[PDB]
Design an enzyme around this catalytic site. Structure first.
Site, short mmCIF file in Angstrom:
data_model
loop_
_atom_site.label_atom_id
_atom_site.label_comp_id
_atom_site.label_asym_id
_atom_site.label_seq_id
_atom_site.Cartn_x
_atom_site.Cartn_y
_atom_site.Cartn_z
N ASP A 182 0.76 15.29 -32.56
CA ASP A 182 0.47 14.31 -31.51
C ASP A 182 -0.51 14.85 -30.47
O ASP A 182 -0.12 15.19 -29.34
CB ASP A 182 1.81 13.90 -30.87
CG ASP A 182 1.71 12.71 -29.93
OD1 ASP A 182 0.78 11.88 -30.06
OD2 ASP A 182 2.58 12.62 -29.05
N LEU A 183 -1.78 14.95 -30.86
CA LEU A 183 -2.82 15.44 -29.96
C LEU A 183 -3.67 14.35 -29.31
O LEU A 183 -4.45 14.63 -28.40
CB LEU A 183 -3.69 16.49 -30.65
CG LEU A 183 -2.97 17.76 -31.06
CD1 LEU A 183 -3.91 18.67 -31.80
CD2 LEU A 183 -2.34 18.47 -29.86
N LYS A 184 -3.49 13.12 -29.80
CA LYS A 184 -4.17 11.91 -29.30
C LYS A 184 -5.67 12.03 -29.02
O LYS A 184 -6.12 11.85 -27.88
CB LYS A 184 -3.46 11.41 -28.04
CG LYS A 184 -2.00 11.15 -28.19
CD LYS A 184 -1.47 10.63 -26.90
CE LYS A 184 -0.06 10.18 -27.06
NZ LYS A 184 0.87 11.31 -27.28
N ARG A 234 15.50 6.20 -25.32
CA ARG A 234 16.56 6.79 -24.50
C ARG A 234 17.89 6.19 -24.94
O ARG A 234 17.93 5.06 -25.42
CB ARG A 234 16.38 6.45 -23.01
CG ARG A 234 15.20 7.09 -22.27
CD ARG A 234 15.33 8.60 -22.18
NE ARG A 234 14.22 9.22 -21.45
CZ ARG A 234 13.04 9.54 -21.97
NH1 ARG A 234 12.76 9.28 -23.24
NH2 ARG A 234 12.14 10.16 -21.22
N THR A 251 3.64 4.36 -23.65
CA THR A 251 4.96 3.83 -23.29
C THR A 251 5.35 4.05 -21.82
O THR A 251 6.31 3.46 -21.33
CB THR A 251 6.06 4.40 -24.21
OG1 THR A 251 6.04 5.83 -24.17
CG2 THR A 251 5.85 3.95 -25.64
N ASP A 285 -12.36 11.06 -27.81
CA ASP A 285 -13.67 11.65 -27.55
C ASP A 285 -14.76 10.81 -28.24
O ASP A 285 -14.49 9.70 -28.67
CB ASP A 285 -13.67 13.07 -28.11
CG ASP A 285 -14.50 14.03 -27.31
OD1 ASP A 285 -13.98 15.11 -27.02
OD2 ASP A 285 -15.68 13.72 -26.98
N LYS A 334 7.65 16.75 -34.09
CA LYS A 334 6.40 16.40 -33.44
C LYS A 334 5.88 17.53 -32.57
O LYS A 334 6.57 17.97 -31.65
CB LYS A 334 6.56 15.13 -32.59
CG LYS A 334 5.27 14.61 -31.97
CD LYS A 334 5.48 13.35 -31.12
CE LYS A 334 5.90 13.65 -29.68
NZ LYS A 334 4.93 14.38 -28.85
N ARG A 360 13.49 14.08 -24.80
CA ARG A 360 14.50 14.49 -23.82
C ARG A 360 15.97 14.09 -24.05
O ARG A 360 16.87 14.84 -23.66
CB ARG A 360 14.03 14.14 -22.41
CG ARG A 360 12.92 15.07 -21.92
CD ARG A 360 12.15 14.51 -20.74
NE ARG A 360 11.22 13.46 -21.15
CZ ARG A 360 10.21 12.99 -20.41
NH1 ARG A 360 9.98 13.47 -19.19
NH2 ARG A 360 9.45 12.02 -20.88
#
Ligand code: U5P
Ligand code: U5P
Lengths: 237, 234
Positions: free
Chosen positions: B58-60, B183, B121, B63, B31, B213
């Site tokens: 994933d630039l979301k 996680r 999230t 506009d 990603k 992470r």
């Protein structure tokens, strides 16, 4: 706090198209806007190219993600050397604050951190679309005021809103707070996908800090005459 | 998707390539987010695709309709597998994004799957009520935004693991649910609110998991990915 130069929206598919359009404006002081279309094709190189040509730059990417990603992405954008950058207020306060911290940490010593503004409700979003599709029960003008207040509380310099919300925003925020307003058309121009529209003249009247003008200049028969007409109305002639 | 989507949240191309090196020739679903893309531009997408990586840009995009349409045409020339918009942009905007994506994709090439971000999230119900001004519950809002995405012709949504069962009660079974906020048991939640383990994501019906992470900030990333992969598969 007001800006004299109309921000020209460089909504082109390539750097080549952009540079061709900007050719007649070679000796003119410019405040340009790089959006998703131009940036997603060329990347950081286009921001650098326009900065070398001494243009003031608005990098309109509207960052809307989790706090840490926006913080890390703003560190990269602050290293580019832009003058104005933005986020969506629909991302929340924690996110808008992280964006500000990102710009502060990514900016080298000796230069000023890019001005940060928040998008309230897009100029293409009607109250009906905002209530039915977005599920926001409050009125559009109240949502814009609330979002602008959240932006100020987060430490932001201003907001992106339409001209018709500027007067109400200034009843809740500081006078030095920026109102950058797109959805600008001349009297004989088509509204396109814009729903909350105003002329450069109406924008000056209602107290807009800066105007973002795209298609009224870019898709006109004579972009030079159009930019002159837009600026005359914006200054007060 | 059997492969967990790795969040390449790095500050440059070299730090990404150095992270990806101990993985060798293993098939990876990666990603590229705002951080990597706003630093390198289209070049990083072109580099990762040569190493035969399945890609999620994933630039979301959030506009006005015409800007999203035009921007999606540019992203469709990069040859990605998955891309996204924010459902908070409305139906007209999500439809325009699909149109730009199918128009910009070269003939013979597969159209990138388009998914819509519902509620991040990292957003809690209290923050969604007090700050975003949505009076409805987070779960009902995520389901509504998912329905808006489907009626617009989109392939799926980005949501949390805890909304997946509620979405599938209102949408088609072939609709995708890409779930971040992942996680491992002992891992710190950071800025994420609606957290889950790779195992719970499998149980609740998630189509794909986005892990960042828990893999990237670990001692040995390759071992961390394997633990995340085996818990996700079974
Ligand atoms: O609420 C907003 C925020 C930004 N823009 C941007 O400003 C420009 C306006 O384009 P035009 O309608 O003047 O041609 C576009 O690049 C668009 O993405 C809007 O139109 N409305
Ligand atoms: O609702 C969403 C949508 C996307 N992401 C993205 O997925 C990754 C998850 O990061 P991490 O919390 O696993 O480390 C990030 O790059 C982030 O931008 C979320 O975290 N939540």
């Amino acid at each position: 706090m007001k800006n004299n130069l109309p921000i020209i929206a460089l909504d082109f598919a390539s750097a080549e198209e952009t540079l061709a359009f900007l050719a007649p404006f070679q000796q003119e002081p410019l405040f340009v806007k790089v959006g998703m279309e131009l940036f997603y094709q060329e990347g950081p190189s286009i921001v650098k190219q326009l900065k070398e040509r001494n243009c003031e730059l608005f990098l309109d990417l509207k960052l809307h993600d989790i706090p840490t990603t926006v913080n890390k992405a703003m560190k990269r954008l602050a290293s580019l050397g832009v003058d104005l950058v933005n986020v969506h207020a629909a991302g929340g306060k924690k996110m808008m604050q992280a964006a500000l911290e990102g710009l502060e940490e990514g900016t080298p010593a000796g230069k000023k951190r890019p001005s940060l503004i928040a998008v309230t409700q897009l100029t293409s979003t009607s109250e009906q679309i905002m209530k039915d599709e977005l599920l926001i029960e409050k009125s559009l003008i109240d949502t814009v005021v609330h979002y602008s207040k959240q932006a100020e509380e987060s430490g932001l310099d201003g907001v992106v809103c339409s001209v018709h919300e500027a007067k109400a925003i200034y009843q809740a925020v500081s006078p030095s707070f920026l109102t950058v307003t797109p959805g600008i058309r001349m009297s004989e121009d088509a509204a396109n996908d814009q729903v909350r529209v105003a002329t450069p003249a109406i924008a000056r009247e209602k107290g807009s800090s800066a105007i973002v003008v795209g298609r009224s200049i870019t898709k006109a028969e004579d972009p030079v005459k159009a930019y002159k007409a837009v600026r005359l109305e914006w200054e007060g002639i």
